[PDB]
Design an enzyme around this catalytic site. Structure first.
Site, mmCIF file in Angstrom:
data_model
loop_
_atom_site.group_PDB
_atom_site.id
_atom_site.type_symbol
_atom_site.label_atom_id
_atom_site.label_comp_id
_atom_site.label_asym_id
_atom_site.label_seq_id
_atom_site.Cartn_x
_atom_site.Cartn_y
_atom_site.Cartn_z
ATOM 1 N N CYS B 161 0.804 -1.240 0.000
ATOM 2 C CA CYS B 161 0.000 0.000 0.000
ATOM 3 C C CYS B 161 0.832 1.284 0.000
ATOM 4 O O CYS B 161 0.323 2.365 -0.297
ATOM 5 C CB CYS B 161 -0.903 0.029 1.243
ATOM 6 S SG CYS B 161 -1.521 -1.597 1.750
ATOM 7 N N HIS B 301 -4.638 7.293 4.628
ATOM 8 C CA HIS B 301 -4.540 5.947 4.074
ATOM 9 C C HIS B 301 -5.958 5.444 3.915
ATOM 10 O O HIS B 301 -6.386 5.135 2.801
ATOM 11 C CB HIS B 301 -3.671 5.080 4.981
ATOM 12 C CG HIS B 301 -3.584 3.632 4.570
ATOM 13 N ND1 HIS B 301 -2.970 3.233 3.441
ATOM 14 C CD2 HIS B 301 -4.036 2.478 5.203
ATOM 15 C CE1 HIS B 301 -3.025 1.891 3.353
ATOM 16 N NE2 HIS B 301 -3.682 1.431 4.431
ATOM 17 N N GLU B 312 -5.715 5.383 12.363
ATOM 18 C CA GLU B 312 -5.371 6.676 11.779
ATOM 19 C C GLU B 312 -5.962 7.846 12.567
ATOM 20 O O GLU B 312 -5.298 8.867 12.752
ATOM 21 C CB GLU B 312 -5.784 6.747 10.306
ATOM 22 C CG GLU B 312 -5.190 7.943 9.581
ATOM 23 C CD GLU B 312 -5.091 7.728 8.093
ATOM 24 O OE1 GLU B 312 -5.839 6.879 7.563
ATOM 25 O OE2 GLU B 312 -4.271 8.419 7.456
ATOM 26 N N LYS B 333 -9.929 7.121 -1.180
ATOM 27 C CA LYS B 333 -10.215 5.712 -1.448
ATOM 28 C C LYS B 333 -11.715 5.425 -1.360
ATOM 29 O O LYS B 333 -12.198 4.413 -1.878
ATOM 30 C CB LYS B 333 -9.450 4.787 -0.498
ATOM 31 C CG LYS B 333 -7.945 4.801 -0.680
ATOM 32 C CD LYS B 333 -7.298 3.625 0.035
ATOM 33 C CE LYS B 333 -5.784 3.604 -0.148
ATOM 34 N NZ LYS B 333 -5.129 4.855 0.344
ATOM 35 N N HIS B 338 -8.783 1.074 -3.247
ATOM 36 C CA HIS B 338 -7.376 0.959 -2.873
ATOM 37 C C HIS B 338 -6.555 0.513 -4.060
ATOM 38 O O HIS B 338 -6.621 -0.648 -4.467
ATOM 39 C CB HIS B 338 -7.260 -0.025 -1.715
ATOM 40 C CG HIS B 338 -5.879 -0.138 -1.131
ATOM 41 N ND1 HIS B 338 -4.857 0.654 -1.510
ATOM 42 C CD2 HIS B 338 -5.377 -0.985 -0.148
ATOM 43 C CE1 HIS B 338 -3.759 0.327 -0.811
ATOM 44 N NE2 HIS B 338 -4.081 -0.675 0.027
ATOM 45 N N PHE B 397 0.465 -2.932 4.242
ATOM 46 C CA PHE B 397 0.647 -4.314 4.702
ATOM 47 C C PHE B 397 2.077 -4.544 5.169
ATOM 48 O O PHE B 397 3.032 -4.115 4.521
ATOM 49 C CB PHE B 397 0.251 -5.327 3.615
ATOM 50 C CG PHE B 397 -1.148 -5.133 3.087
ATOM 51 C CD1 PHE B 397 -2.204 -4.858 3.955
ATOM 52 C CD2 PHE B 397 -1.416 -5.238 1.725
ATOM 53 C CE1 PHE B 397 -3.494 -4.676 3.473
ATOM 54 C CE2 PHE B 397 -2.704 -5.054 1.240
ATOM 55 C CZ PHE B 397 -3.741 -4.770 2.111
HETATM 56 K K LIG Z 1 -2.981 8.937 1.258
#
Ligand SMILES: [K+]
Ligand SMILES: [K+]
Lengths: 412, 410
Positions: B161, B301, B312, B333, B338, B397
């Site tokens: 990621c 993320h 987060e 996202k 993703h 990950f």
């Molecule tokens: K980002």
């Protein structure tokens, strides 16, 4: 500004041995680690041999429960990493864990696992894909799992640059330390691409030696009868450490990493230009990074994969960079014995370069029976050559024209 | 040596370039739909973010394209776009100073599937001669350098990621160190195939909201059930400041900070307190010489996972304290899904564009924020606001974390 970087720990699995000292013993004795492949049936393939890791026992490193979740390239990477950390004597604590990172890479990664899971998908369906397929196969999980096992909280990443992976991984990890992003890095690479897809894929590209009748003579860098590289498996890891950090804890220092250079050929998808122009620019970058006169270079551990274009390009590049000094240094390809470990090649070869400094000896290029036209340098044919080595280079000139050079120097 | 962004390029589920994708982002449009290219009846997830209508022959000849896996085609498209956008003229005088760092999370799964099909059914001599060169991850960087004649540092990251974020950050380091004046950096991915969807499906990592695919990606929403897998690519032309000025380059923004950390915690699920993500953001801010209070927008993320999204929130609260309520944070996202190896690259672009346009992109689908998710998460609709400093986070990950800090350039 730019801090100094030393090597305080090393670890390895190779076709020659299950650790650093055993592998190094084989290297200095001129032993080949190449043999017909036993772990799968290769009767239908044009190449049926390679450098396998022999007698690896993952139970020396990991529980059976954890090991079965992991592709072999990850097992190998973790093994070399655990060895290197142990060898360094470093004690990981709350006080330093944020300053210790990992950069272990691979060229192809979990190809055996991908192939096996594709078979399950095709023949049985998607519900038969392993839940551990992704975490057990993607390339960054050597860095991932190592950090979890040992509590390493610094920069955490993975390179994938084919033949140059291990070299980039070590170089960029040194850059982290030099920059102040970390005080310690575990860096290198691992590979296990000896499956149907790997041997079949490189075979379809006509990239491999097909000397099935004499596998130990197959890898013969700069020999007029070379016919492609030999695919090999294993792993190399180094513990890189900031100099004052190493001194402060009384660490044993193997050598200093003084230079790192990179370039792109921008030429061809698989073969370098025969004049080795990109390789030459790479070495020049590395020498300037290290603030060295070319004449200071004593030993070069070559890329030397035993390919027609590849091998001759390195001779040309060495002559261009070093001029008359090209005849004073010694250059050898340890791939003559280990074959080509792909993503792990630069890692095991950095270790060999560091050991060449420790023991003041140049490893041989075995099988160099008849050097090809123009290959008239000291290529350390047949047997190891004790000599003065104050500065050693390790070169990797990989698929896609991606080039990396590391410069090591004796520490005192 | 300061690093600026002078060109950008993209393929995403929202468009075949940057402006089309950005228009979709600001409109709150979803790029997620049932997957059309294969039969997914036996799979638990049957939708994702596909690139639609991609025409590779705008970039490469049919012969050139044929050998290359889709992830490489996508990476080349974004890179070509970015180089063109930058206006840079490559010459003998500068080619050794221009390099490439384009990465991928998993790489050539489609080509691997196809060559497996041939291997199993007809044997090894039916594997494509171009399988290896057309499938290995460093071949985006490899092919790009060959096509454009780029002779500088040449490499590829693979950090799941976080690939795109690491790629951009480490390319900036190359320029700052003096080993390059220009870097083309970013990532690409095409994993929304049988092995990818089945593989992440087997790990129970994906949303299974098959009946409403556009509602599936819902970061911080109480009913989230895993991430949505998406395809595409992003690329940035990073350039040394004086180099950019001397040629009269248009400068989108400045890259002022890059931070990294490892969670050293779990395979896929970050610690609930987001301790690793917090250290990463702090490292990035320190690298930029900035105080937390200077941050206006965070592109999260935010993959729409139970553990990931909440970590987060905790990380942002720990780093920014009371200022955590003044900044805006959103997950694009929610619309893009993703993009794995490409996520950090496309999201770096969205962050730069947030700075250009002074608008925070929405987090769509945020109908019922989960417990503790009480920050300004730009729910539902784009929010014009002052943005001087933007962060982009990738918490991937393996617990591998990267944070980029972008600032307005005047
Ligand atoms: K980002
Ligand atoms: K070497």
């Amino acid at each position: 500004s730019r801090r100094r970087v030393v090597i305080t720990g090393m670890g390895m699995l190779s076709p020659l041995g299950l650790d650093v000292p055993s592998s190094w013993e084989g290297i200095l004795a001129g032993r080949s680690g190449i043999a017909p492949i036993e772990h799968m049936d290769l009767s239908a393939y044009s190449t049926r041999f390679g450098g396998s890791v022999k007698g690896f026992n993952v139970e020396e490193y990991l529980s059976a429960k954890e090991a079965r979740k992991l592709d072999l390239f990850i097992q190998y990477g973790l093994a070399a990493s655990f060895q290197a950390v142990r060898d360094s004597g470093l004690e990981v604590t709350d006080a330093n864990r944020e300053r210790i990172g990992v950069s272990m890479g691979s060229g192809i990664g979990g190809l055996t696992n991908i192939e096996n899971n594709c078979r399950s998908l095709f023949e049985q369906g998607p519900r038969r894909i392993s839940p551990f397929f992704v975490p057990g196969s993607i390339i960054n999980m050597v860095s991932g799992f190592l950090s979890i096992h040992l509590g390493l909280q610094g920069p955490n990443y993975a390179l994938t640059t084919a033949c140059t992976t291990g070299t980039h991984s070590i170089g960029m990890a040194a850059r982290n330390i030099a920059y102040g992003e970390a005080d310690v890095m575990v860096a290198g690479g691992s590979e296990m691409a000896a499956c149907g897809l790997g041997l079949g894929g490189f075979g379809a590209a006509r990239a491999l030696s097909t000397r099935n009748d004499e596998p130990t003579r197959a890898s013969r860098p700069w020999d007029r009868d070379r016919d492609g590289f030999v695919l090999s498996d294993g792993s190399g890891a180094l513990v890189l450490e900031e100099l004052e950090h190493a001194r402060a804890r009384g660490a044993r220092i193997y050598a200093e990493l003084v230079g790192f250079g990179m370039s792109g050929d921008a030429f061809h998808m698989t073969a370098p230009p025969e004049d080795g122009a990109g390789a030459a620019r790479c070495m020049k970058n590395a020498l300037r990074d290290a603030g060295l006169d070319p004449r200071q270079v004593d030993y070069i551990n070559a890329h030397g994969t035993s390919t027609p274009a590849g091998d001759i390009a390195e001779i040309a590049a060495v002559k261009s960079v070093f001029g008359e000094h090209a005849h004073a240094l010694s250059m050898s390809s340890t791939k003559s014995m280990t074959g080509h470990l792909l993503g792990a090649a630069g890692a095991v070869e950095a270790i060999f370069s560091v050991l060449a400094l420790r023991d003041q000896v140049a490893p041989p290029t075995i099988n160099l029976d008849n050097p090809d036209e123009g290959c008239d340098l000291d290529l350390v044919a047949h047997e190891a050559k004790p000599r003065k080595i104050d500065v050693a280079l390790s070169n990797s000139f990989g698929f896609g024209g991606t080039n990396g050079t590391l410069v090591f120097r004796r520490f005192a």
